[model samples]
Target: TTIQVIGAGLPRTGTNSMKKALEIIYSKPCYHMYEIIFKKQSDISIWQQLIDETHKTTSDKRKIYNGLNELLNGYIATTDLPSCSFYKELMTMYPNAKVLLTIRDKYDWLYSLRKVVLPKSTDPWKLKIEEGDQVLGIDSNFYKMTEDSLKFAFQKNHINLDDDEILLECYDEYNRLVQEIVPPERLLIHHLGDGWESLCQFLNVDIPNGISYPCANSHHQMTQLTEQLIKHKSLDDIIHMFPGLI
Candidate 1:
């Protein structure tokens, strides 16, 4: 299926909730970073390549996006990492797709990034394997890929991870860029707390009755979900138990 929804939000910005909500609305998979970790491990190498190519001045991004579209052929909506990083390219590629920018309080966003997302990069398996030692069954390769992508994202914005002020500046800069770049009719700047009404209105979908809006990937849920994935639980099982997660 073709992608009809493109999320321009960074991680720690209710992306997981958006993913789940979009999946429910569309009745198809909504791509998220968790999809990469759990279902598309091989795509990690492609993402690493994409990240590297994105850093180069003369890179052929259309070819890269072609490859990505093929890789994500079954997904109808996309959010989180690879998607967030390549939003401009994706928007150009899928001109008719709607863009959603998920946002939250800057301090809270920074705190979630530092506490939950950033720590995943330095997981023991990542460090061990990144140093050239084999770490079996830990998905260390994927972690390394993720770490590199995260680093590139920060570097692209000239933000230092250690400085909160700079990071917050980068966050505002990103939001402003999206606001300036996307056409008003095709773009919706959203917060998870705005709930299903705003989202349904934007997408022109009927809101489901008797279902509350999802609030996923909080700091605590992030840690717990990662632990569950590490323990080899099925994605279906995890989602069934934690319906909030994508």
Candidate 2:
């Protein structure tokens, strides 16, 4: 199946939760940053190449479009970066795919991003995650890919995680850009807590009975997972700890 939805939201905008929500709706794999972590080495490498190729002063941007088709061969939806960062290209690649822009308050969005991911390099918790990635056999390239995603999303070369003002502006501008680019009829602007009704309506799908909208990957939950990763030195049983997260 081809990608049917592009979650054009930055990380910490409830993307982790959206990942599961979309998966439930599509009954197929939904690519997310977590997918890069759990999938395979080749997925990470291929994303790095895609990120690199996106910025080149080159002949055919459609070449990258073709590359994404091959990358997401069996997936029907995508949430979170680096996939979200490329939502524009994905829009062109999958002509019929619908775009979902998940928006949050700029201040809250920056806070969650700092608390969850992209903590300043000197932050001790950042180092803990580094150790956790090491224990999980995740290559450094994954971090590089994420960094590039931030750059791609905000259209910035250098990012300072500690700079709250700059980040807030970038978040605001990026959201506005998505609004400006996507045709109104083709776009769905989803606020952070606006759950399945609007989303289901936009996609022409019925909301499932008895299942609450997913709320995954909060700051405290991610911290607990990272610390446990460092402690356990493996994710062999880690997925069980965070029930809905994985």
Candidate 3:
């Protein structure tokens, strides 16, 4: 009944962990990407394309999205910029829906993403290329190059890209878009540093003192990395595949 949407760009933005944390706090089922990964009938591409193309009506899309929402009691899905376009429709669909935007400092975010996700040679999505074919002809450079360069400069110079800096930009963008549509009371902005307290309060739920939610996105990343490693031959293969990566 309480649907949640995890916003912020990229998959490993702690969506999974947030899902479990929410589940524990709310005492209800919280479905994340982990569920979709196994649900073959749940075609992500459809929702993906809905976001990318803006192909259908908001009501229609909401109907489709609800199928996903119905998968669990407290559903949270990790969708990136693609779904941002559907903000209005989503707000309309679940009028009481809660939005949790997880943000890390830009440099840290870029670093974590590059190290675990975006490297050209190590890109799990590029495993077909690694295994000897170029079927997807996927271009890792677009997401990797610019983000990684910023990440490297930060690491070398001890530069700080604060959470406020990274999140403010996103917040402004999403807020501006949604403000015109949804009432002010419906939106809640959260930071990872706030941990479970901020989240539980926002949801109007009591937090368990010692309970810890099984972090979900990290598991998704681990599964992806491990799968990529196995597909390409070895762990080292995935690690060293990245150029200029030591």
Candidate 4:
């Protein structure tokens, strides 16, 4: 299947919910960070190669995008990192694909981000997540990949997640960049409760009746999910319970 949606949003902006929503809309898999951790772990090395070979200039992006096309062969939509950072290249490659940006309150967004996912030194959720990273085998150069993405995407050598100002600056510039990069018609800016109407209208698809917009990776659920990972790990436990999360 061909890619139809390039999610240009940053993480912690309801990406997991959008993943599920897009999966249902397209009736196909949506690539997210979770997908990489669970299903595409093997693709990590390929991603690293893509990162290294891609010159600082976006001129080499089309060549890199060709490589990505094969990697995302079966996925119809993409969100979260490892791919969101390359939305510009993906948009260039998939001319027909529409871009979606998920927006949220900046302070609230920072709060959510620190509490989970990329945690702070004193960030409440830690051990289980660290163990979850170990169990998932993501504590390796996987972090290196994430850093490369941050550096490449934002053009910053070092990212200090501890500094709220640094993060807020990146967040502000990232959204502005998306707005600057994409044409108005091809881009849809989404808020948390904007729900299915705007999305379906943008993509010209029928909205599901009697179904709520999917939600995933909430703080509470993160704890539960990580606890499961620390014990039995992500793939089986995630699929067995929070099927929509994928």
Candidate with top lDDT is 2
Ranking by lDDT: 2, 4, 1, 3
Candidate 2 deviant stretches above 4 angstroms:
none
Lowest summed lDDT across 10 adjacent residues in model 2 is found at 54-63
Report the lDDT tens digits of candidate 1 across residue range 50-86: 8777668798877778877876799998998876867
Worst lDDT run of 10 residues, candidate 4, spans 54-63
- Candidate 2 residue lDDT tens string, 88-157: 8889888899999998988888777877778877778778878877876775788888888788889877
Instruction: Report the alpha-carbon TM-score of model 2 versus the true structure.
Output: 0.95
lDDT for model 3 comes to: 0.46
Ordered list by TM-score, greatest first: 2, 4, 1, 3
Clashing pairs in 2: none
User: Model 2 Cα RMSD, Å?
Assistant: 1.5
Tens digit per residue, CA lDDT, model 3, 128-175: 333321211223432333333233312222323334355335434544
Which residue pairs overlap in candidate 3's backbone? 16-216, 16-217, 17-216
Stretches of model 4 off by over 4 angstroms after superposition: 55-59, 121-125, 231-243
**TM-score-best of 1 and 4:** 4
Question: Estimated TM-score per prediction?
Answer: 0.83, 0.95, 0.56, 0.89
Q: Model 3 TM-score?
A: 0.56
Candidate 1, lDDT over the whole model: 0.76
Global lDDT of each candidate: 0.76, 0.84, 0.46, 0.82
Counting only residues 3 or more apart in sequence or on different chains, how many pairs clash (N, Cα, C under 3 Å) in candidate 3?
Answer: 3
Q: Give Cα distance to truth, residue 45, candidate 1, Å.
A: 0.6
